[PDB]
């Protein structure tokens, strides 16, 4: 599935992201829209590590999840890499969710830090009621 903008900003505040170890709703909205194009089904092999990122979140699977193809991959989510290319976000935000409880909180992505830190995030959740 290919959220709408706002689609996500309600979906995402539903599953009690909105402010979740502080980080903002906009803040998730802008790390959706760099890793994914709000495109639940994306995903994207890393040829270097044979790692893979999966989801709306490209969430990477040497660490967060397992697809039985990684090597000396861990499953800190504890799911399986599947649970996320699923049209409900409900297991990403839970992986997602744990993500931030280590220490980088946000930063774990580099993408957030390339085009969401210290920038003006406002735009990703303008009128969208959240």
């Known amino acids: 599935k290919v959220f709408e903008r706002c689609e996500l900003a309600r979906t995402l505040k539903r599953l009690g992201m ?30 270097g590590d044979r790692s893979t990122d999966y989801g709306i979140f490209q969430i990477n699977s040497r660490y967060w999840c397992n697809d039985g193809k990684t090597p000396g991959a861990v499953n800190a989510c ?17 992986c997602a969710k744990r993500t931030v409880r280590d220490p980088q909180g946000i930063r774990a992505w580099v993408a957030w830090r390339n085009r969401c830190q210290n920038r003006d995030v406002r735009q990703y959740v303008q009128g969208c009621g959240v």
Not at 78 to 94: E, F, G, K, P, T
């Open 18 to 47: 909105d402010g979740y170890r502080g980080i903002s709703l906009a803040n998730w909205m802008c790390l959706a829209k760099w890793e994914s194009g709000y495109n639940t089904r994306a995903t994207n092999y890393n040829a």
């Open 78 to 94: 504890h799911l399986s890499c599947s649970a996320l290319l699923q049209d409900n976000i409900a297991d990403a935000v839970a």
